[PDB]
Structures are given as C-alpha cells and as structure tokens.
Amino acid sequence: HWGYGKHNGPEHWHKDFPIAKGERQSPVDIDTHTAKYDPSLKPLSVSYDQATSLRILNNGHAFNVEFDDSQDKAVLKGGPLDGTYRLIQFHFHWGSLDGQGSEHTVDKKKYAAELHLVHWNTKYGDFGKAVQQPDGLAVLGIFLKVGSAKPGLQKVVDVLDSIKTKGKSADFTNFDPRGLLPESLDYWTYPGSLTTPPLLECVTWIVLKEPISVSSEQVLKFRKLNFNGEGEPEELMVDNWRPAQPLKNRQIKASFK
Ligand SMILES: NS(=O)(=O)c1ccc(CCNC(=O)Cc2ccc(O)c(Cl)c2)cc1
Ligand SMILES: [Zn+2]
C-alpha cells in the first residue's frame, strides 16, 4: 500500500487518496514573518496529570504510544480550541540524518524529528467519528533537535528493541508525556489534515515554537526500527515524513509576538 519509498511515497498518495491535493493539507512551512499574532487566543492548557499510557506499537509507518481515552484523563484545551480534546496517542516522524525528519518546517528549516500528540474532540464521542469533522482533532506538534539528551524520552527509547518490526507491540504503562514538553508553550496554529493517509482534513494544528533537545544516541535508536515485518527483508524505518504542502487559502496564527 502506501509508504515513504520511491514507489509508494507522498508523491503517489493522491492516486488512492485524492484529498492529498485538498484545500487544507498538512504539513506546511511556517513562515514566521507572515504569521499573525492573535490577542484573542486564550492560554493553552495541557492537563496530563491523570494520563494513562497502555501500550507501544510499531504499525509499519511509525510507533505509537497509546493511552486510555475512555475518560478525560489527559486533555488539551484553550488556545484556538473550543471544548475538550482527549489524548489518544503520540508518535514521531524522523529522518535518516540530523538535518531532516520533521514534517512542518520553520522558515524552511527542517528539524531532526517531530513529535505528534494526537487528541480528539470529545463532543464527537469517539476517534472514528472525530476524523470526519473539520474540528475533530487537535494535534500538538513538537520539534526535536539534536543536542543534549531528553531524560523523559529514554523510557521510550529503551523499549524500541522489543517492537523492532511491523505489528509488534509491548506493554507501556505508567509513562508520563509531560516529560516530552519544552518549557514554553508559545505556538503557531492553523487548520490542516492528518499527515498520512487517509489524510482527512479534520485537524487543528498547534505547533510549539520551542523545540526539545534529544541526544544523537536517542535518535539513532529511532533509526534502528524496521518498516518491514519479522522475517522479511530489512528496511530501516527512517524518513517517515511528508514534505511541506501548499498553504493555499489559509492563515497561520501565532500566540506570541
Ligand atoms: N501524523 S498525524 O497527522 O498526527 C496522524 C494522526 C493520527 C493518524 C491515525 C488515523 N487513523 C485512522 O483514521 C484509522 C481509524 C479509523 C477509525 C477509528 O475508530 C480509529 Cl480508532 C482509527 C494519522 C496521522
Ligand atoms: Zn504524525
């Protein structure tokens, strides 16, 4: 099916998923000098105190740390968001080299990786229904640069050996996602889509200005994962990012000056 190779990559997705050339596709390049400061935006509220992580899965495209979203245990509110959005999972997109890997770019600059904390609007009952709504999801994006290690990410790095191939999963309870956040919550926001098929245009993107630093050794372990399943020829899971798409008729708002 779809992937990140030369024959099934982003350039090919539009054939099976025509929405790939849609009105509000993601990611996009964030031109910092074109974004408009919006004084009406309310403070962003990240409430992850009662977060309940459950499992980590290699789905052949990336790895997901899944949470229990049967109640409002971990939610995102405020900012450009109306209502409550529950955290369902988080994952990353990364490159084969430190100079590439992120999906969104800042003034054309590419980061080593990008973290996506996915949340769904509770007004819609379940994730499946939410992806069919223009304001169904809220994804918090965090850029990762290479430098000093991120203590809060090590627990994720150390379990990757147990889910090397597609389809593999492992118990991953008691993980605190608050350990992956930077100091500042300053952000940029715009209406977009999922960055992978089905590419549904149901996302309110909130991208933080401040990146987090991770060590070369931590990102190197991300690159040892496989796109393939067990017993199959090895294809390293690297460069699983979609490039920037046309902004078209959209405006990016900033929470800061
Ligand atoms: N890179 S990104 O923009 O943050 C991002 C985030 C999340 C997704 C997963 C979307 N999955 C489905 O749509 C399948 C589904 C369909 C019905 C369901 O009930 C359930 Cl649970 C799942 C893709 C990309
Ligand atoms: Zn993503």
Domains annotated for the chain, with CATH where assigned, are: 1-257 (3.10.200.10)
One-letter amino acid of 114? E
One-letter amino acid of 182? P
75-78 and 85-94 beta bridge pairing: antiparallel
Strand partners, 105: 29
- Ligand 1 near 116 CB (within 6 A): yes
Residue 127 phi/psi, 5-degree rounding, is: -55, -45
CA of 57 to the centre of ligand 1 (A): 14
Alpha-carbon torsion (2, 139, 208, 115), positive or negative: negative
- Ligand 1 near 138 CB (within 6 A): no
Atom index in ligand 1 nearest the CA of residue 129 equals: 19
- Ligand 1 near 199 CB (within 6 A): no
CA of 240 to the centre of ligand 2 (A): 9
HSE, side-chain direction, 13 A CA sphere, residue 159: 18
CA dist 200 to 58, 122, 129, 180, 192, Å?
A: 22, 18, 12, 26, 9
- DSSP designation for 105: E
Interacting residues of 158 by C-beta distance below 8 A, sequence separation 6+? none
- DSSP designation for 142: E
Annotated binding site for substrate: 195-196
Strand partners, 67: 53
- Ligand 1 near 245 CB (within 6 A): no
Interacting residues of 24 by C-beta distance below 8 A, sequence separation 6+? 191, 192, 193, 201, 248, 250
C-alpha span between 73 and 94 (Å, rounded): 28
User: Which of the residues 1, 12, 61, 104 is marked catalytic?
Assistant: 61
Annotated binding site for Zn(2+): 91, 93, 116
Burial annotation 158-194 (CB, 10 A radius, 16+ → b, else e)? ebbeebbbbebbeebeebebeebbeeebebbbbbbbb
Chain center to CA of 36: 23
C-alpha span between 82 and 199 (Å, rounded): 22
One-letter amino acid of 87? L
- Ligand 1 near 127 CB (within 6 A): yes
Q: Is 61 a catalytic residue?
A: yes
Cα Rg of the chain, angstroms:
17
C-alpha span between 235 and 21 (Å, rounded): 28
Residue nearest to atom 1 of ligand 1 (CA): 195
CA of 245 to the centre of ligand 2 (A): 15
Residue nearest to atom 19 of ligand 1 (CA): 128
Technique that determined the structure: X-ray
Residue nearest to atom 16 of ligand 1 (CA): 128
For the range 128-132, what are the long-range contacts, defined as Cβ-Cβ under 8 Å and sequence gap of 24 or more? 130/202, 131/194, 131/198, 131/200, 131/202, 132/200, 132/202
